Amino acid sequence: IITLPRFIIEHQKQFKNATGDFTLVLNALQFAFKFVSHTIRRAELVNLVGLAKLDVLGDEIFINAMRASGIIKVLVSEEQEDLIVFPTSYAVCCDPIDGSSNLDAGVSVGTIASIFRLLPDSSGTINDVLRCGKEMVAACYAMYGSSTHLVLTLGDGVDGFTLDTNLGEFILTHPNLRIPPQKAIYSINEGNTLYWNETIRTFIEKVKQPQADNNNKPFSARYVGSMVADVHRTFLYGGLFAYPCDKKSPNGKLRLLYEAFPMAFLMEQAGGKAVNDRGERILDLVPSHIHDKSSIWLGSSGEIDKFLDHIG
Amino acid sequence: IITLPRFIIEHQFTLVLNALQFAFKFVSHTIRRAELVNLVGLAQKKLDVLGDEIFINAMRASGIIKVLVSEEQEDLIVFGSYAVCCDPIDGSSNLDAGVSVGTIASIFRLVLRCGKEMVAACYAMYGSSTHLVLTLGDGVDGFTLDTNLGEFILTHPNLRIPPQKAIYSINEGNTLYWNETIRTFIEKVKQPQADNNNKPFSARYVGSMVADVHRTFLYGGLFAYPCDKKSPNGKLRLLYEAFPMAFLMEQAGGKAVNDRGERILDLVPSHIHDKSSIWLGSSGEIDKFLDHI
Amino acid sequence: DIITLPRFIIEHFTLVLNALQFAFKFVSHTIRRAELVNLVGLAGKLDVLGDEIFINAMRASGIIKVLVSEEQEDLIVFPTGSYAVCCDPIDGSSNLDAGVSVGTIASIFRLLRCGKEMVAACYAMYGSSTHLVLTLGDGVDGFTLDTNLGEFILTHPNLRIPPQKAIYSINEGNTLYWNETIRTFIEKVKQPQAKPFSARYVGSMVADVHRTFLYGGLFAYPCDKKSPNGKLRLLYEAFPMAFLMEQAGGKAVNDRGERILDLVPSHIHDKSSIWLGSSGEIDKFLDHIG
Amino acid sequence: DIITLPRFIIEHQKQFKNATGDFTLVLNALQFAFKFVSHTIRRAELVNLVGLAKLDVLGDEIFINAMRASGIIKVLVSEEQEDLIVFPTNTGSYAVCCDPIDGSSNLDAGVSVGTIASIFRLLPDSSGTINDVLRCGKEMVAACYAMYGSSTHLVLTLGDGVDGFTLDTNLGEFILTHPNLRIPPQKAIYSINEGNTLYWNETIRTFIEKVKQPQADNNNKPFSARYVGSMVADVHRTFLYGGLFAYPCDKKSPNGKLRLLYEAFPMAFLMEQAGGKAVNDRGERILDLVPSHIHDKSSIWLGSSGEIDKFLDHIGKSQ
Ligand SMILES: [Mg+2]
Ligand SMILES: [Mg+2]
Ligand SMILES: [Mg+2]
Ligand SMILES: [Mg+2]
Ligand SMILES: [Mg+2]
Ligand SMILES: [Mg+2]
Ligand SMILES: [Mg+2]
Ligand SMILES: [Mg+2]
């Protein structure tokens, strides 16, 4: 039995850094995820049962854990317009609860986060965050579903943990997670078909046709509407997830810094691909503000290759 | 604070509802363990098989259900004045992803035929939180599982599904197998809608029917699994999926019909695992589907 | 089969038992948070909380018109029911700061009354596990709180206290304040028995008596110079425990040897000395004083 | 700010040049085992009654598995194992000596029990031998216990005071709730099994008679008596309220009952670090003792420093 704390300490002592600040960032993250998971599980009872808003609570929990780490200098959070700078080194960028529109339904939602190391000559500015995707040291998400899962990369493949609620421990259940190169599942909001251009529309028409590499069967469709849950299914089963540009969202909806970046990092480390609508590698992009958006297609390498060929 | 046992005594069979809520708490805990069921010992089955076992054991031990239909037993179960028909875990293909799944059940007083002859229906939706949604015959009530206390607590009393909401829930990978009436209605929902600020419907499809329908109850909208060339009688089982959801849906102020627009509660199954197509949800959006056919 | 407490109480007012078991689960969870109740918020006093939890559940039951609570001086009557409840919501208050076993104790009446008149009695013992021990009139049953499911499951059906067992449970710090009869009895249990007794005294009466139920032995809190009428409250501590003990096959008397359940409180907070436990060991005590 | 055990340990260890993470991994193994044991003990009879669709043996197994999985505990002493346990596939950094569930005789009653553990650093260049544990108590590097009662508590020393943590079951995290715990020097509570009065010599018997007499030191009140019968629970109360705990030699237990290596030693280290004292019946410092075998027993008196000073005065006069 391998728990996340031992997994992390063992990884970090490869670098003579078992007690370094990175271990405290991970400790802060896993504490925040267990707290958010429990709070999300209580659902309406949060406001209803006393001692004798849910996305706001998630934000507060995450900010508090990060500050109490003592070593995160800088934090971007989706509901804070401005860069958060703490009094007393890593930068964390996060959507504490993504999929908020699913909360009232009690379906799956999640937390998503990228981690940067402060630039050498830095006391904590937007320069430590407005960077190329390739400078992330780590990325992770917690998927709050019928079970809670933590999926992480430190630059060396992907590992998945399940939360043991009897013990409050993340236990390694999917080591060296690999996304299958081929799987006929696609995940997109076809309600936005009206607003897509012809290239995007015709690709989505293609996946509904019989597929030779799928026994002449068309793709199957799934769309929870919580990006973390859809992409988690994509990691485990294979397939495609997309949120393209459209007339109402000319640059997508995923936030580049703390949603498209971390998911692209995880996806590449699992053997998948992640690109924007133009076929550019997501990790090659650089945000201009902390809340830039990007379109995204990510998932099974074979299926992304099909999208890339279509764009031609 | 109204807990479910209090709700059930005040509304007074009570044993049958007790056995059901017990099974749901047990199944919900097991599902939250996910892979840890086979990895972590005290110091190798499948979740769907365990869920069936938990549910059948609870039913059998109630002492009061003589006859049982479960999605995964081919044959009728005989063990007492009541019968229950159940899918103990629906959305099995979502279990490995840890997304929302659920249990669905219809209850008959004593043997398992016309849909209007259910005395009660309910589901448990195992998502990021666990919910129980229940009808006794007079409206719908929704409960949230408090794991601190191990009690379902009334949180959505007199639940009413909004009459209008532009959300549709369907597997559009099956487009190739739909007839033109179905295909064109789905084409229609993607057009601008005057009743949605000139915007198309938004699409959602978890792929676990109980989760998608639970969202439909709380948000409004449309859920469909129509007939198609590979599933000519649909996918949902009439006896223990379509019937109970239809009964819940009508008691909440919505509609539930098959692909021909026949009311689901009017149907009668010829064998315990009969399938049926279904369109259910907001009354106004189902009226749009009815006008379309 | 797994038998839950709801199944048990319907297979056998039901609303009263359900309000009680709800309160017990809520108090158990709260006590398990201990200091965290005051240090951890939604984003990052215990005896008072337990009282409020119990009173709120009793009021919300609808069925309870009148309640006696150890932490309420005056009788309390609600607006809307045919039953009275008398309770110590957390007994063993002085052990809370140590995190050790404590308990809730309650008696139920239909409609200041004889102990024969209680309809039912129960306690919840919050220890390293949480237990509920109950009687309605025909023997006693013990349940364990399964925290995975939030259900009391029957674990001790038809509980029977062994008639003899050499364990005694008493605060010998009060030896200075006892009369000669009590002093010499306690001196006797330390002599070899055809080995002497073993001593155990958690200091939470519910825990000490729960152990006595399961292993056998004697629990006592006699009159002393500082507490001439004992310390246990007759109405909601001595009564319910005596009811359960007799229904389990044991005995419960006061220092004068009189049956606890024959007594009648004259005020809701009256106190009584008590000796309860294995019938053989209580017999030995009776011989000693009588 | 909420302080969790892992942050507390990591912030402590990163002060040290030579912290490799191995000690943090020992604490992680222990806190994992404590949470698992606490959950198992809360199940009680249900472990044998409720399946998928005895406790002290389970506790021992949980503990051995966690210590082995740490990767860095080379040597393990456990009460229930007759022999010294070696994990040859682990690095030779630490030895752990523990009673995984002490107070077993109380488990059937559902009252408080606990885990007690001492931690030693292996001797330089040791492969892992019984020389690594058969040592003077003053050589422990750390000591802790987990008290499983109506709440679960972890009490710990790393050699500079004592800190107490409460287990948050919603999170599965030990949270710092009693920083820099100090046991009162004076407090009129005594914890002893007076059922054993027959088997004590006259010096012990007369001391226990003294504590039942009026103390001018307590406004002419006697001591109050408490004795759960689980040593970890009674000693935990002693830490938090003050008082005395004792299990002396008696004719049936000529060397007492606590095990020196993994019970008297760690409790004595915690007691001294909280400001109390811990001696045997003869008044010898518990931590000055050396076990001759891993399961040696010792008499013990421990608690508030002023109450132990009274016991020491008594045995000095009685000579
Ligand atoms: Mg968000
Ligand atoms: Mg977001
Ligand atoms: Mg199924
Ligand atoms: Mg099904
Ligand atoms: Mg009280
Ligand atoms: Mg009391
Ligand atoms: Mg032991
Ligand atoms: Mg021991």
Q: Which residue of A has its CA nearest to B189?
A: A191
Helices within C12-89 (DSSP H only): 14-33, 36-39, 46-61
For tokens 């129960």, name the residue.
Answer: C122
Q: Would you state the structure tokens that stand for residue B190, as one six-digit string?
A: 């993607």
Residue partners of A91: CB distance under 8 A and separation at least 6: A72, A73, A74, A75, A76, A115, A116, A117, A118, A124, A128, A129
Distance between B54 CA and the closest CA of chain D, angstroms: 4
> What single-letter DSSP state applies at residue C161?
-
d(CA D7, CA C290): 63
Contact (Cβ atoms closer than 8 angstroms) between residue C194 and residue C223: no
The residues spanned by each domain of chain B are 1-158, 159-293
In sequence order, the 6+-apart residues with CB closer than 8 A to the CB of D104 are D55, D56, D113
> Can you spell out the DSSP letters for D8-40?
HHHHHHTT-TT--SHHHHHHHHHHHHHHHHHHH
B86 C-alpha to center of ligand 3: Å? 9
Q: How was this structure determined?
A: X-ray
Rounded CA-CA distance C145/D41 in Å is: 12
- The per-residue DSSP string of B31-44 comes to HHHTTHHHH-----
**Assigned token pair, A28:** 């802060």
Alpha-carbon distance of B117 to B109, in angstroms, equals 8
Cross-chain residue pair C18–B6, CB shorter than 8 Å: yes
Exposure pattern of D276-299 as b/e (b: 16+ CB <10 Å)? Answer: bbbbbbebeebbebebeebebbbb
Token output for C52:
């409020």
| Tokens 């919505």, residue located | B254
Residue B140 DSSP SS3: strand
Question: Are C148 and B29 a contacting pair at CB < 8 A?
Answer: yes
CB contact under 8 A, C25 and B150: yes
Q: Judging by beta carbons within 10 Å of its beta carbon (0-12, 13-18, 19+), is residue A249 exposed, middle or buried?
A: middle
Amino acid identity, position C199: A
Cβ-based contacts of A35 with chain C (< 8 Å): 44
Q: Which structure tokens are listed for D307? A: 């109450």
Which listed ligand is nearest to B52 at the C-alpha?
3
Which residue has 């008082």 as its token pair?
D243
User: How many Cα neighbours within 13 Å face the side chain of D250?
Assistant: 17
Question: B232-251 burial, b for 16+ CB within 10 Å, e for fewer?
Answer: eebbbbbbbbbbbbbbbbbb
**Rounded to whole angstroms, how far apart are CA atoms C285 and C258?**
12
User: Which chain C residues in 12-31 lie under 8 Å from chain B, judged by CB atoms?
Assistant: 14-15, 18-19, 22, 25-26, 29
Q: Helix, strand, coil % (nearest 5) of chain D?
A: 40, 25, 35
Give the position of tokens 């223990």: B240
Q: Which residue in this structure is represented by tokens 């152990």?
A: C211
Strands (E) in A165-253, as ranges, are 169-174, 185-187, 220-221, 240-243
To test the contact with chain C by mutation, choose from A40, A51, A164, A165 the residue with the greatest count of C C-beta atoms within 10 A, namely A51
* Alpha-carbon C279 to chain mean position: 18
Contacts of C149 in chain B (CB under 8 A): 22, 25-26, 29, 150
d(CA C159, CA B132): 35
CA-CA distances (angstroms) from residue A126 to A135, A290, D72?
Answer: 14, 8, 41
Task: Locate C229 and state its tokens.
Answer: 């009428």
CB B140 within 8 A of CB B248: yes
Q: Which of residues 154-173 of B touch A (CB under 8 A)?
A: 155-156, 168, 171-173
Q: Write out the binding residues of D for Mg(2+).
A: 79, 99, 101-102, 263
Cα separation, B27 vs B4, whole angstroms: 17
Q: How far apart are CA A259 and CA A241, in angstroms?
A: 13
DSSP states along D246-258: EE--BTTBTT-SE
CB-side exposure of C151: number of CA atoms within 13 Å? 27
Question: Which chain D positions have a beta carbon within 8 Å of C156's beta carbon?
Answer: 45
From chain C, the residues in CB contact with B148 under 8 A are 26, 29, 150
What is the DSSP-derived secondary structure letter of residue B201? P
Size of interface B-C (CB pairs under 8 A): 56
Give the distance from residue A75's alpha carbon to the nearest chain C alpha carbon, in angstroms. Answer: 17
CA-based nearest residue in chain D for residue B38: D52
- Quick check: helix, strand or coil at residue B5? helix
In chain D, alpha helices (H): 5-13, 22-43, 46-49, 55-69, 202-211, 231-241, 265-273, 305-318
Q: Which ligand is nearest to the CA of D247?
A: 8
User: What's the CA gap between D62 and D60, in Å, rounded?
Assistant: 6
**Residues 6 or more apart in contact with residue C85 via CB below 8 angstroms:** C16, C20, C58, C64, C66, C67, C68, C106, C107, C108, C109
Contact residues on chain D for A67, CB-CB shorter than 8 A: 1
Helix (H, G, I), strand (E, B) or coil at B186: helix
Both tokens assigned to A58: 């998630």
Give the bridge partners for D303, in sequence order: D244, D277
What is chain C's length? 290
Who contacts B134 (Cβ-Cβ below 8 Å, separation ≥6)? B120, B121, B122, B140, B141, B142, B143, B248
CA distance A63 to B150: 30
Distance, CA of D240 to CA of D178 (rounded, Å)? 9
User: Which residues in A lie closer than 8 A to residue B218 (C-beta atoms)?
Assistant: 104-105
Look up residue D67 and give its amino acid.
M
Q: Report the Cα–Cα distance between both ends of chain C, in Å, rounded.
A: 47
Q: How far is CA D190 from the centre of its chain?
A: 18
3-state helix, strand, coil in chain B (%, to 5): 40, 30, 35
Identify the three-state secondary structure at position B228.
strand
A51 chain-C contacts, CB cut-off 8 A: 30, 37, 49
Q: What's the gap in Å between the CA of D190 and the closest CA on chain A?
A: 35
| Residues in the annotated binding site of C for Mg(2+) | 70, 88, 90-91, 237
Question: What DSSP state is assigned to residue D223?
Answer: P
CA distance D234 to C47: 21
> Cβ contact (<8 Å) for B1 and A49?
yes
Q: Quote the radius of gyration of chain B (alpha carbons, Å).
A: 19
Query: Quick one: which of A33, A55, A60, A95 has its CA closest to A227?
Result: A95
**Which residues of C fall within a CB distance of 8 Å from D241?**
97-98
List the chains bordering chain B where 3 or more Cβ pairs fall under 8 Å: A, C, D
Residue closest to D114 by CA, chosen among D151, D73, D158, D76 = D151
**Site of tokens 């029990």:** D113
Phi, psi (deg, nearest 5) at residue D155: -120, 135
Alpha-carbon distance of A272 to A178, in angstroms, equals 8
In chain A, positions 38-67, which contact chain D (CB-CB < 8 Å)? 38, 64, 67
- In chain A, which residue's Cα lies nearest the Cα of C56? A52
The Cα–Cα gap between A296 and A278 comes to 9
Could you give the maximum distance between any two Cα atoms of chain D, in Å? 65
Please tell me the distance in Å from C80's CA to the nearest CA on chain D. Answer: 34
Instruction: List the binding residues of B for Mg(2+).
Output: 71, 87, 89-90, 241
How many A from CA of D100 to the centre of ligand 8?
Answer: 8
Upper half-sphere CA count for residue B30 (Cβ side, 13 Å): 28
Cβ–Cβ under 8 Å, residues A138 and A23: no
Instruction: Report d(CA A110, CA A37) in Å as an integer.
Output: 9
CA B40 vs CA B33, B94, B178, B238: distances in Å: 10, 22, 45, 38
Question: B25: distance to nearest CA of chain A, Å?
Answer: 13
Q: How far apart are CA B251 and CA B255, in angstroms?
A: 9
Residue among D2, D44, D228 whose CB faces C202 most closely: D228
CA distance A253 to A255: 6
D152-157 and A169-174 beta bridge pairing:
unpaired
CB of A1 less than 8 A from some CB of D:
yes
> What residues 213-252 of chain B have any CB closer than 8 A to a CB of chain A?
214-215, 218-219
What tokens appear for B163 in the block? 């009459």
Crossing angle of helices B14-33/B47-62, nearest 10°?
A: 160
DSSP class of A166: T
Interchain CB contacts (distance < 8 Å): A and C: 22
Q: Select the residue from B90, B101, B128, B212 to test the A interface by mutation, using most A Cβ atoms within 10 A.
A: B128
Distance between Cα C198 and ligand 6 center (Å): 25
Find chain D residues with C-beta within 8 A of B22's C-beta.
none
Residue D221 Cα to ligand 5 midpoint, Å, equals 24
* Nearest-CA distance C81 → chain B (Å): 13
Pairing of strands C251-253, C274-277: antiparallel
The tokens describing A202, both together, are 């015709």
Q: Is D149 on the interface with C (CB under 8 A)?
A: yes
Residue among B130, B172, B204 minimizing CB distance to A208 = B172
Q: Where are the alpha helices (DSSP H) in chain A?
A: 4-13, 21-42, 45-48, 54-69, 198-207, 227-237, 261-269, 301-311
Specify the residue for token string 């319907």: C10
**A191 contacts in chain B (CB < 8 Å):** 168, 189-190, 200-203
Binding residues of D for AMP: 9-13, 20-24, 93-94, 121
A187-211 burial code (b ≥16 CB/10 A, e <16): bbbbbbbebbeeebeebbeebbeeb
Residue pair D163/D181 in contact by the 8 Å Cβ criterion: yes
Q: What are the backbone angles phi and psi of residue A39, rounded to the nearest 5°?
A: -65, -40
Q: What secondary structure does DSSP assign to C98-153, as a single string? A: GT--EEEEEEEEE----GGG-SEEEEEEESSSEEEEEESSSS-EEEEEETTTTEEE
Q: Output phi, psi for D288, to 5 deg.
A: -80, -10
Residues C282 and C253 sit within 8 Å (Cβ to Cβ): yes
Ligand 4 ion: nearby residues, β-carbon < 5 Å:
B 87, 90
Chain D residues within an 8 Å CB radius of A10: 21, 25, 71
Among the partner residues B43, B50, B148, nearest to D52 by beta-carbon distance: B50
Backbone angles phi, psi at C113, to 5 degrees: -150, 160
Determine the distance in angstroms separating the CA of D161 from the nearest CA of chain C, rounded to an integer: 19
Residues 6+ apart with CB under 8 A from B232: none
